[PDB]
Structure formats: C-alpha cells, structure tokens
Amino acid sequence: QADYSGEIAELYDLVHQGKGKDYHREAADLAALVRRHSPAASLLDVACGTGMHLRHLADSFGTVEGLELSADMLAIARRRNPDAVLHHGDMRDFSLGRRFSAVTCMFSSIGHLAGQAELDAALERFAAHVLPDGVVVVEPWWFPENFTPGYVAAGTVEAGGTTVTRVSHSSREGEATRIEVHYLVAGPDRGITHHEESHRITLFTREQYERAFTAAGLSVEFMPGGPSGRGLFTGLPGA
Amino acid sequence: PQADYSGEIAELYDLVHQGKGKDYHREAADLAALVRRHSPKAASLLDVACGTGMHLRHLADSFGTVEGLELSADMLAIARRRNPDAVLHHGDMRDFSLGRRFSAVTCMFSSIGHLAGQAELDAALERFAAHVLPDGVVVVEPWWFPENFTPGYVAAGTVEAGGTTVTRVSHSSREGEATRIEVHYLVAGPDRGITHHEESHRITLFTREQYERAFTAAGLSVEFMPGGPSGRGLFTGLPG
Ligand SMILES: CN[C@H]1[C@@H](O)[C@@H](C)O[C@H](OP(=O)(O)OP(=O)(O)OC[C@H]2O[C@@H](n3cc(C)c(=O)[nH]c3=O)C[C@@H]2O)[C@@H]1O
Ligand SMILES: CN[C@H]1[C@@H](O)[C@@H](C)O[C@H](OP(=O)(O)OP(=O)(O)OC[C@H]2O[C@@H](n3cc(C)c(=O)[nH]c3=O)C[C@@H]2O)[C@@H]1O
Ligand SMILES: Nc1ncnc2c1ncn2[C@@H]1O[C@H](CSCC[C@H](N)C(=O)O)[C@@H](O)[C@H]1O
Ligand SMILES: Nc1ncnc2c1ncn2[C@@H]1O[C@H](CSCC[C@H](N)C(=O)O)[C@@H](O)[C@H]1O
C-alpha cells in the first residue's frame, strides 16, 4: 500500500513509540515555537495522522483542529481526541473558512507532495489559514544533499503481549526516496501476519521549500536539527 | 511455507543462531566433558542431524574422530564446507546404517522433536544404540515436554553482520501432540532491498516417559538431566 490504512494505520502508534518518537517533547517544543511568534489561541495540525501531536497540544491552546487525508488514520485521531474537530481533506485543496494562530505540518508529511506545483499549493493553503500575527511550521523531508541511499532501518517493539517488527529500505528514485517497508506482527492469540507498504517521498530542496513559502507570501526561516534531524521551516505572513 | 531446512533458511541459520546467542563452543565443551565422564577413553563421535555442522567443528578439537548424519542436502552442504576433513553422511535418523560404532552418538537442539511418533522415536533410538560402543553414551536433547509448552509463545530477534540484516519472528501453538511453530524472516540490505521468508514445522511434544521408553526399548539405561543447552534438559543413555 501507499495510503496509511488498515493494519498499517493501527500499527503506526506503536511502531513509533518503539522508535522513541516523543510527541510530548515535540508538542511542547512546537507549542513554544509558536508562542515565540504568536504570544495563543488556536492551532491547525495538517496531516495530523493518528492525532498524537494534537493530544499534547490541546492543553496548550484555546483551540486545536486537524486535517488528515486517510480515513483509517483519522478514526484513530478522533478516538484519541473525541472533543476536537478533525477534518477529512487534502492539504493541497481545502478551505475551512477560519484562521488559526499556528498551522503545523509535521514528520515530513509534506514529502507526500509530488512537485513544486503541489508544494506551492499547500503553502498557499497554509498561508490562507493563518492569522496575520500567526505562524506556519513545516518539518520537511531530507534534502537531496542529505539523502543516504541504501539505508536499512530495523526495529522491534512489544506492548500488550503484541510484538511488531518493522524494516525499511530506502533507495533513490528521480527526486524522491522510494522507501519500502515490511512488518511482521505477532501476538499470543492472533498469530503472525506479514505486511508491506511502499512510498514515494519527494526530495525537495531547501530552496524549493523556501520558494513555496515566499510565493505564499510568507517570510521563511530554516532551523536545523528539528524533531527528526531534518530541521524545521517556519513562515510568517506579510512578506 | 517450507518444512525442509532448505535454500534461504539454511544460508541464514548460522547467522540467525549467533544472533540468538547460541554458543556452539561451550555446548561442545560441555558435551565432551559429559561424554568423557562416562567414557573416559572416548575418542570417536557421531552427531545425528548435525545441521550446518557447528557442534562438529568444535568437537573435532576434543575427539580424534567425528562424523555426522543429516537429512537436508542444503544443510549438509554447509556442514561439509565447515568440515572438509570429516565424513558426513546423507540420510535419516530413522533408518540408516553406517559401517561402524562410536564412543558417543549425539542429537542436539531438539532435532529429535522432528519425529512424528513413538514408532519413529523408538526407530531412531534403536539406530543410535546400534552405533554406540558398550563403554559409551548416547545423548539426546529433547524438545519441550507437554507439561512445559507455552501455546502462544512469540520470539523476535534481529541481527546484522557484514551488510546483511536479518529479523526473525516465531509464533507457536498446540497442534495435537505437536508444537506448531511458524517462523518469518525479513532479510535486507543496501543493494538487495528487502525479502520475506517463512517456514512452519510440527515439533512433536513427547512426554518424558516416551523418550525414556524409547531408550529403554533400545537397551539403553536412560537418565534425564535438567537444564541443558536450552532449558530442555538432556537425556543420556548407556548400553547394558
Ligand atoms: C510520515 N513520515 C515517515 C513515513 O513516511 C515513513 C514511511 O518513512 C519515514 O519514516 P521514518 O522517519 O520512520 O524512516 P526510517 O527511520 O524507517 O528510515 C529513515 C529514513 O531517513 C533517511 N535518512 C536518514 C538519515 C539519518 C540521514 O542522514 N539521511 C537520510 O536520508 C533514510 C530513510 O529513508 C518518514 O519519515
Ligand atoms: C532445531 N530446533 C529448532 C527449530 O526446529 C525451530 C524451527 O524452532 C525452534 O527454534 P528456537 O528453539 O530458536 O525457538 P524460538 O526462539 O523460536 O521459540 C522457542 C520455542 O519454545 C517454546 N517454549 C519456550 C519456552 C521458553 C518455554 O518455557 N516453553 C515453550 O514451549 C515456544 C517456542 O516454540 C527449535 O528449537
Ligand atoms: N495530501 C495530503 N493531505 C493531507 N494528509 C496527507 C496527504 N498526504 C499524506 N497525508 C497524510 O500524512 C500522514 C503521514 S504520517 C504523519 C503523522 C503525524 N503528522 C505525526 O507526526 O505522527 C498520513 O496520515 C497521510 O495520510
Ligand atoms: N529424520 C531426520 N534425520 C536426520 N536429520 C534430520 C531428520 N529430520 C530433521 N533432521 C535435521 O534436524 C536438524 C534440526 S536443526 C538443528 C541443527 C543442528 N543439530 C544444531 O544443533 O544446530 C535439521 O538439519 C534437519 O534437516
């Protein structure tokens, strides 16, 4: 698959716990990042997936909302966040008719975009949903200079009797990484099952991301490291 | 899945089991010490279902003469490679006939489990008795007893050596008198990408008294020794 669904979706949360991903820390850092620019009322997490960031962010802002494309990923988010408004929708083409102090897009979700025209589009959509003293925060994929082809990642986690193993292989394919992922899933009653997904995650350059912020009328800054080592862009309207 | 220890499962077996922390060197050292406590002048050994032949390599350095038996070609093939100066045979613990007799006959790592019932169990213990010296000793590592089997057991292990990464997950259930053990592998590498393999076996859950009967039926006075190389204890037989 390539669509974050079924057992992949149900697995995602556990998988990334196993990986040490710390949405509390990330949410806290992000909340702080936003208050630096909008000293605040409201946040929209776009491609909020399973709603992990949202869960921690809800204590930090008057209002938090989500936008997700996958229906199965979104169900999980709604169960984790029953009191929050979560939208089915496409970061490239969406209107909600309100603005927010922060509009965030985390964990390289932007790389699911296919080229400059799709990137520009979502940035125009983000700029449109951000209050003018507000901020747009996007964590990119890796740039091409930093892509390491042939990369193999192997990790195992157990929880609730249930063990999940995930192996990823990354190779080059045009201006994209083709990351191929297999899972083995095992539990005392359910047995073992095999899974696999393959994704194309576009390898936009620093300067293409920045293009898109500028065309959306946002000023743009890159800050290295970030939650994933890929860094973190911000954009402030009125440029 | 395959139940035959062939192709890919064979190539991996050795890496996988180093990965598991299996110390064939200490296992041999404990063997040789056991064999000799019983048979102080032993000097010869047959390892039945010797597999990739890991025990045998270390057993060379304790006994002047070692040989092996193994049903799987692809496993046998790797054992011969590891043991150039040894005579290793192709065939079946149930029905086999070399020309000779050895101070010790061994069958390790629950290979014995791979027999389907008492008939076969007794068949194999008869053959072992046929190939041991009077002053010698037969040693079989059993599979788990029924009193100790754990339906629903999961084992997951990953290991990396020289750019090959291998992950193994197993699940086990009860299936009649047997363990049903279903095992999956993901193998991966920078150029090779990821491939997926699997196997399923039936491993017979023999009761202690069934092992004992088989030894006894074959003229061997039996004793069970707790613990052993894998938790499963160790059965020793001496002619008389
Ligand atoms: C929603 N985003 C996820 C999702 O799309 C998933 C399918 O792939 C990636 O997940 P991981 O971040 O878990 O990746 P994993 O840990 O399995 O592999 C790390 C990836 O990062 C690359 N990488 C990693 C490092 C450390 C580097 O310096 N350069 C670099 O290009 C190699 C591999 O594609 C995305 O981030
Ligand atoms: C040549 N023998 C091998 C081979 O036939 C293979 C297919 O399965 C077993 O491999 P492992 O022993 O590595 O097994 P693993 O780590 O996958 O799991 C341990 C097995 O032992 C059972 N078990 C394990 C424990 C610890 C116990 O207390 N009781 C019990 O029944 C559950 C599982 O089938 C055989 O030993
Ligand atoms: N065009 C698009 N619009 C909105 N969401 C998208 C999208 N393309 C992919 N996605 C979503 O991006 C997500 C990648 S997983 C990222 C999850 C979440 N942001 C976290 O940090 O844990 C998936 O939910 C996928 O369905
Ligand atoms: N009927 C039989 N006769 C001889 N070998 C057998 C057999 N049935 C299974 N085997 C072998 O039993 C082995 C169990 S795997 C264990 C290998 C080796 N003894 C070790 O200690 O690591 C496999 O090589 C399999 O081919």
Coordinates of all heavy atoms in Angstrom, one line a residue, chain B residues 122-183:
Chain B
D122 N 11.3 -44.6 18.7 CA 12.0 -45.9 19.0 C 12.9 -46.3 17.9 O 14.0 -46.8 18.2 CB 10.9 -47.0 19.2 CG 10.0 -46.8 20.4 OD1 10.3 -45.9 21.4 OD2 9.0 -47.5 20.4
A123 N 12.4 -46.2 16.7 CA 13.2 -46.5 15.5 C 14.6 -45.8 15.6 O 15.6 -46.4 15.4 CB 12.5 -46.0 14.2
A124 N 14.6 -44.5 15.9 CA 15.8 -43.7 15.9 C 16.7 -44.0 17.1 O 17.9 -44.2 17.0 CB 15.4 -42.2 16.0
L125 N 16.1 -44.2 18.3 CA 16.9 -44.7 19.4 C 17.5 -46.1 19.2 O 18.6 -46.3 19.6 CB 16.1 -44.6 20.7 CG 16.2 -43.3 21.5 CD1 17.6 -43.2 22.2 CD2 15.9 -42.0 20.7
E126 N 16.8 -46.9 18.5 CA 17.4 -48.2 18.1 C 18.6 -48.0 17.2 O 19.7 -48.5 17.5 CB 16.3 -49.1 17.3 CG 16.8 -50.5 17.1 CD 17.6 -50.7 15.8 OE1 17.0 -50.2 14.8 OE2 18.7 -51.3 15.8
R127 N 18.5 -47.1 16.2 CA 19.7 -46.8 15.4 C 20.8 -46.2 16.2 O 22.0 -46.6 16.0 CB 19.3 -46.0 14.2 CG 18.3 -46.6 13.2 CD 18.4 -48.1 13.0 NE 19.4 -48.4 12.1 CZ 20.3 -49.4 12.3 NH1 20.4 -50.1 13.4 NH2 21.2 -49.6 11.3
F128 N 20.5 -45.4 17.1 CA 21.6 -44.8 17.9 C 22.3 -45.9 18.7 O 23.5 -45.9 18.8 CB 21.0 -43.7 18.9 CG 20.4 -42.5 18.3 CD1 19.7 -41.6 19.1 CD2 20.4 -42.3 16.9 CE1 19.1 -40.5 18.6 CE2 19.8 -41.2 16.4 CZ 19.1 -40.3 17.2
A129 N 21.5 -46.7 19.4 CA 22.1 -47.9 20.1 C 22.9 -48.8 19.2 O 24.0 -49.3 19.7 CB 20.9 -48.7 20.7
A130 N 22.5 -49.0 18.0 CA 23.3 -49.7 17.0 C 24.7 -49.1 16.8 O 25.7 -49.8 16.5 CB 22.5 -50.0 15.7
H131 N 24.8 -47.7 16.9 CA 26.0 -47.1 16.5 C 26.9 -46.6 17.7 O 28.0 -46.0 17.5 CB 25.8 -45.9 15.5 CG 25.1 -46.3 14.3 ND1 23.8 -46.6 14.2 CD2 25.6 -46.5 13.0 CE1 23.5 -46.9 12.9 NE2 24.6 -46.9 12.2
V132 N 26.6 -47.0 18.9 CA 27.4 -46.7 20.1 C 28.2 -47.8 20.7 O 27.8 -48.9 20.7 CB 26.6 -46.0 21.2 CG1 25.6 -47.0 21.9 CG2 27.5 -45.4 22.3
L133 N 29.4 -47.5 21.2 CA 30.2 -48.5 21.9 C 29.7 -48.8 23.3 O 29.2 -47.9 24.0 CB 31.7 -48.1 22.0 CG 32.4 -47.8 20.6 CD1 33.7 -47.0 20.7 CD2 32.7 -49.1 19.8
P134 N 29.7 -50.1 23.8 CA 29.4 -50.6 25.1 C 29.9 -49.7 26.3 O 29.2 -49.7 27.3 CB 30.3 -51.9 25.1 CG 30.1 -52.4 23.7 CD 29.9 -51.2 22.8
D135 N 31.1 -49.2 26.1 CA 31.6 -48.3 27.2 C 31.2 -46.8 26.9 O 31.6 -45.9 27.6 CB 33.1 -48.4 27.3 CG 33.9 -48.7 25.9 OD1 33.3 -48.6 24.8 OD2 35.1 -49.0 26.0
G136 N 30.3 -46.6 26.0 CA 29.9 -45.3 25.5 C 28.5 -44.8 25.9 O 27.8 -45.4 26.8
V137 N 28.1 -43.7 25.3 CA 27.0 -42.9 25.7 C 26.3 -42.2 24.6 O 26.9 -41.6 23.8 CB 27.3 -41.8 26.7 CG1 28.3 -40.9 26.1 CG2 26.0 -41.1 27.1
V138 N 24.9 -42.3 24.7 CA 24.1 -41.6 23.7 C 23.5 -40.5 24.4 O 23.0 -40.6 25.5 CB 23.0 -42.6 23.2 CG1 22.0 -41.8 22.3 CG2 23.5 -43.8 22.5
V139 N 23.4 -39.3 23.7 CA 22.9 -38.1 24.3 C 22.0 -37.4 23.3 O 22.4 -36.9 22.3 CB 24.0 -37.0 24.4 CG1 23.4 -35.7 24.9 CG2 25.2 -37.5 25.2
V140 N 20.7 -37.2 23.7 CA 19.7 -36.5 23.0 C 19.1 -35.4 23.8 O 18.6 -35.6 24.9 CB 18.5 -37.5 22.8 CG1 17.4 -36.7 22.2 CG2 19.0 -38.6 21.9
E141 N 19.2 -34.2 23.2 CA 18.5 -33.0 23.7 C 17.0 -33.1 23.2 O 16.7 -33.0 22.1 CB 19.1 -31.7 23.2 CG 18.9 -30.5 24.1 CD 19.5 -29.2 23.6 OE1 20.2 -29.2 22.6 OE2 19.1 -28.1 24.2
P142 N 16.1 -33.2 24.2 CA 14.7 -33.3 23.8 C 14.2 -31.9 23.4 O 14.8 -30.9 23.6 CB 14.0 -33.8 25.0 CG 14.8 -33.2 26.2 CD 16.2 -33.1 25.7
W143 N 13.0 -32.0 22.8 CA 12.1 -30.8 22.7 C 11.3 -30.7 24.0 O 11.5 -31.5 24.9 CB 11.1 -31.0 21.6 CG 10.0 -30.0 21.3 CD1 8.7 -30.1 21.3 CD2 10.3 -28.6 21.0 NE1 8.1 -28.9 21.0 CE2 9.1 -28.0 20.8 CE3 11.5 -27.8 20.9 CZ2 9.0 -26.6 20.5 CZ3 11.4 -26.5 20.5 CH2 10.1 -25.9 20.4
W144 N 10.6 -29.6 24.2 CA 9.9 -29.4 25.4 C 8.9 -30.5 25.7 O 8.4 -31.2 24.8 CB 9.1 -28.1 25.5 CG 9.9 -26.8 25.3 CD1 10.1 -26.1 24.1 CD2 10.7 -26.2 26.3 NE1 10.9 -25.0 24.4 CE2 11.3 -25.1 25.7 CE3 10.9 -26.4 27.7 CZ2 12.1 -24.2 26.4 CZ3 11.7 -25.6 28.3 CH2 12.3 -24.5 27.7
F145 N 8.6 -30.7 27.0 CA 7.6 -31.7 27.4 C 6.3 -31.0 27.2 O 6.3 -29.8 27.2 CB 7.8 -32.2 28.8 CG 9.2 -32.9 29.0 CD1 9.9 -32.7 30.2 CD2 9.7 -33.7 28.0 CE1 11.1 -33.3 30.4 CE2 11.0 -34.3 28.3 CZ 11.7 -34.1 29.5
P146 N 5.2 -31.7 27.2 CA 3.8 -31.0 27.2 C 3.7 -30.2 28.5 O 3.2 -29.1 28.5 CB 2.9 -32.2 27.2 CG 3.6 -33.3 26.4 CD 5.0 -33.1 27.0
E147 N 4.0 -30.8 29.7 CA 3.8 -30.0 30.9 C 4.5 -28.6 30.8 O 4.0 -27.7 31.5 CB 4.3 -30.8 32.1 CG 5.8 -31.0 32.2 CD 6.2 -32.3 33.0 OE1 5.4 -32.7 33.8 OE2 7.3 -32.8 32.7
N148 N 5.5 -28.4 30.0 CA 6.2 -27.1 29.8 C 5.9 -26.2 28.6 O 6.6 -25.2 28.5 CB 7.7 -27.2 30.0 CG 8.2 -28.6 30.1 OD1 9.0 -29.1 29.3 ND2 8.0 -29.2 31.3
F149 N 5.0 -26.7 27.7 CA 4.9 -26.0 26.4 C 4.0 -24.8 26.7 O 3.2 -24.8 27.6 CB 4.2 -26.9 25.3 CG 4.0 -26.1 24.0 CD1 5.0 -25.6 23.2 CD2 2.7 -26.0 23.5 CE1 4.8 -24.9 22.1 CE2 2.4 -25.3 22.3 CZ 3.5 -24.7 21.6
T150 N 4.2 -23.7 25.9 CA 3.6 -22.4 26.1 C 2.9 -22.0 24.8 O 3.5 -21.2 24.0 CB 4.6 -21.3 26.5 OG1 5.6 -21.2 25.5 CG2 5.2 -21.6 27.9
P151 N 1.7 -22.5 24.6 CA 0.9 -22.1 23.5 C 0.8 -20.5 23.4 O 0.5 -19.9 24.5 CB -0.5 -22.6 23.8 CG -0.2 -23.8 24.6 CD 0.9 -23.3 25.5
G152 N 1.1 -19.9 22.3 CA 1.0 -18.5 22.2 C 2.4 -17.8 22.3 O 2.4 -16.6 22.2
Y153 N 3.4 -18.6 22.5 CA 4.8 -18.0 22.6 C 5.3 -17.4 21.3 O 5.3 -18.0 20.2 CB 5.7 -19.1 23.1 CG 7.1 -18.6 23.5 CD1 7.4 -18.3 24.8 CD2 8.1 -18.4 22.5 CE1 8.6 -17.9 25.2 CE2 9.3 -17.9 22.9 CZ 9.6 -17.7 24.2 OH 10.8 -17.2 24.5
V154 N 5.8 -16.1 21.5 CA 6.5 -15.3 20.5 C 7.9 -15.0 20.8 O 8.3 -14.6 22.0 CB 5.7 -13.9 20.3 CG1 6.4 -13.1 19.2 CG2 4.2 -14.1 20.1
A155 N 8.8 -15.2 19.8 CA 10.2 -14.9 19.8 C 10.5 -14.0 18.6 O 10.2 -14.3 17.5 CB 11.0 -16.2 19.7
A156 N 11.1 -12.8 18.9 CA 11.6 -11.9 17.9 C 13.0 -11.5 18.2 O 13.4 -11.2 19.3 CB 10.7 -10.7 17.9
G157 N 13.8 -11.6 17.1 CA 15.3 -11.4 17.2 C 15.8 -10.8 15.9 O 15.4 -11.2 14.8
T158 N 16.6 -9.7 16.0 CA 17.3 -9.1 14.9 C 18.8 -9.2 15.0 O 19.4 -9.2 16.1 CB 16.8 -7.7 14.7 OG1 15.5 -7.7 14.1 CG2 17.7 -6.9 13.7
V159 N 19.5 -9.4 13.8 CA 20.9 -9.4 13.8 C 21.5 -8.9 12.5 O 20.9 -9.1 11.4 CB 21.4 -10.8 14.1 CG1 21.2 -11.7 12.9 CG2 22.9 -10.8 14.5
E160 N 22.7 -8.3 12.6 CA 23.4 -7.6 11.4 C 24.8 -8.1 11.4 O 25.5 -8.0 12.4 CB 23.3 -6.1 11.6 CG 23.9 -5.3 10.4 CD 25.5 -5.2 10.5 OE1 26.0 -4.9 11.6 OE2 26.1 -5.5 9.4
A161 N 25.2 -8.6 10.3 CA 26.6 -8.9 10.0 C 27.0 -8.7 8.5 O 26.5 -9.3 7.6 CB 26.9 -10.4 10.4
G162 N 28.0 -7.8 8.3 CA 28.6 -7.5 7.0 C 27.6 -7.0 6.0 O 27.7 -7.4 4.8
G163 N 26.6 -6.2 6.4 CA 25.7 -5.6 5.4 C 24.4 -6.4 5.2 O 23.6 -6.0 4.4
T164 N 24.3 -7.6 5.8 CA 23.1 -8.3 5.8 C 22.4 -8.1 7.1 O 23.0 -8.3 8.2 CB 23.3 -9.8 5.4 OG1 23.9 -9.9 4.2 CG2 21.9 -10.5 5.3
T165 N 21.2 -7.7 7.1 CA 20.3 -7.6 8.3 C 19.2 -8.6 8.2 O 18.5 -8.7 7.2 CB 19.8 -6.2 8.5 OG1 20.9 -5.2 8.5 CG2 19.1 -6.0 9.9
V166 N 19.1 -9.4 9.3 CA 18.1 -10.5 9.3 C 17.3 -10.4 10.6 O 17.9 -10.4 11.8 CB 18.7 -11.9 9.3 CG1 17.6 -13.0 9.3 CG2 19.6 -12.0 8.1
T167 N 16.0 -10.4 10.4 CA 15.0 -10.4 11.5 C 14.1 -11.7 11.4 O 13.7 -12.1 10.3 CB 14.1 -9.1 11.5 OG1 14.9 -8.0 11.7 CG2 13.0 -9.2 12.6
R168 N 13.8 -12.2 12.6 CA 13.2 -13.5 12.7 C 12.1 -13.3 13.8 O 12.5 -12.8 15.0 CB 14.1 -14.6 13.2 CG 13.4 -15.9 13.6 CD 14.4 -16.9 14.0 NE 13.9 -18.3 14.2 CZ 13.3 -18.7 15.3 NH1 13.1 -17.9 16.3 NH2 12.8 -19.9 15.3
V169 N 10.9 -13.7 13.5 CA 9.9 -13.8 14.4 C 9.2 -15.1 14.4 O 8.9 -15.6 13.3 CB 8.8 -12.7 14.1 CG1 7.7 -12.7 15.2 CG2 9.5 -11.3 14.0
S170 N 9.0 -15.8 15.5 CA 8.3 -17.0 15.6 C 7.1 -17.0 16.5 O 7.1 -16.3 17.5 CB 9.2 -18.2 16.0 OG 9.5 -18.2 17.4
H171 N 6.1 -17.7 16.1 CA 4.9 -17.9 16.9 C 4.6 -19.4 17.0 O 4.8 -20.2 16.0 CB 3.7 -17.2 16.3 CG 2.4 -17.5 16.9 ND1 1.6 -18.5 16.4 CD2 1.9 -17.1 18.1 CE1 0.5 -18.6 17.2 NE2 0.7 -17.7 18.2
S172 N 4.2 -19.9 18.2 CA 3.9 -21.3 18.4 C 2.5 -21.5 19.0 O 2.1 -20.8 19.8 CB 5.0 -21.9 19.2 OG 6.3 -21.6 18.7
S173 N 2.0 -22.6 18.6 CA 0.6 -23.1 19.1 C 0.6 -24.6 19.3 O 1.6 -25.3 18.9 CB -0.5 -22.7 18.1 OG -0.1 -22.9 16.8
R174 N -0.4 -25.1 19.9 CA -0.6 -26.6 20.1 C -1.2 -27.1 18.8 O -2.1 -26.4 18.3 CB -1.4 -26.9 21.4 CG -1.4 -28.3 21.8 CD -0.1 -29.0 22.0 NE -0.2 -30.4 22.5 CZ -0.2 -30.7 23.8 NH1 0.0 -29.8 24.7 NH2 -0.3 -32.0 24.1
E175 N -0.8 -28.2 18.4 CA -1.4 -28.9 17.2 C -1.4 -30.4 17.4 O -0.7 -31.1 16.8 CB -0.7 -28.6 15.9 CG -1.6 -28.9 14.7 CD -0.9 -28.4 13.5 OE1 -0.1 -29.2 13.0 OE2 -1.3 -27.3 13.0
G176 N -2.3 -30.9 18.2 CA -2.4 -32.4 18.5 C -1.3 -32.7 19.5 O -1.2 -32.1 20.6
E177 N -0.5 -33.6 19.2 CA 0.6 -34.0 20.0 C 1.9 -33.1 19.7 O 2.9 -33.4 20.2 CB 1.0 -35.5 19.9 CG -0.1 -36.4 20.5 CD -1.0 -35.8 21.6 OE1 -0.4 -35.1 22.5 OE2 -2.2 -36.0 21.6
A178 N 1.7 -32.1 18.9 CA 2.8 -31.3 18.4 C 2.8 -29.8 18.8 O 1.7 -29.3 19.1 CB 3.0 -31.5 16.9
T179 N 3.9 -29.2 18.7 CA 4.0 -27.8 18.6 C 3.9 -27.4 17.1 O 4.7 -27.9 16.3 CB 5.4 -27.2 19.1 OG1 5.5 -27.5 20.5 CG2 5.4 -25.7 18.9
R180 N 3.0 -26.5 16.8 CA 3.0 -25.8 15.5 C 3.8 -24.4 15.7 O 3.4 -23.5 16.4 CB 1.6 -25.7 15.0 CG 1.4 -24.6 14.0 CD 2.1 -24.9 12.7 NE 1.6 -26.2 12.1 CZ 2.3 -26.9 11.2 NH1 3.5 -26.6 10.8 NH2 1.8 -28.1 10.8
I181 N 5.0 -24.4 15.1 CA 5.9 -23.3 15.1 C 6.0 -22.6 13.8 O 6.5 -23.2 12.8 CB 7.3 -23.8 15.6 CG1 8.4 -22.7 15.6 CG2 7.9 -24.9 14.7 CD1 8.1 -21.6 16.7
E182 N 5.6 -21.3 13.7 CA 5.5 -20.6 12.4 C 6.5 -19.5 12.5 O 6.4 -18.7 13.4 CB 4.1 -20.2 12.2 CG 3.7 -20.0 10.7 CD 2.5 -19.2 10.5 OE1 1.5 -19.5 11.1 OE2 2.5 -18.2 9.7
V183 N 7.4 -19.4 11.5 CA 8.6 -18.5 11.6 C 8.8 -17.7 10.4 O 8.8 -18.2 9.3 CB 9.9 -19.3 11.8 CG1 11.0 -18.3 12.2 CG2 9.9 -20.4 12.9

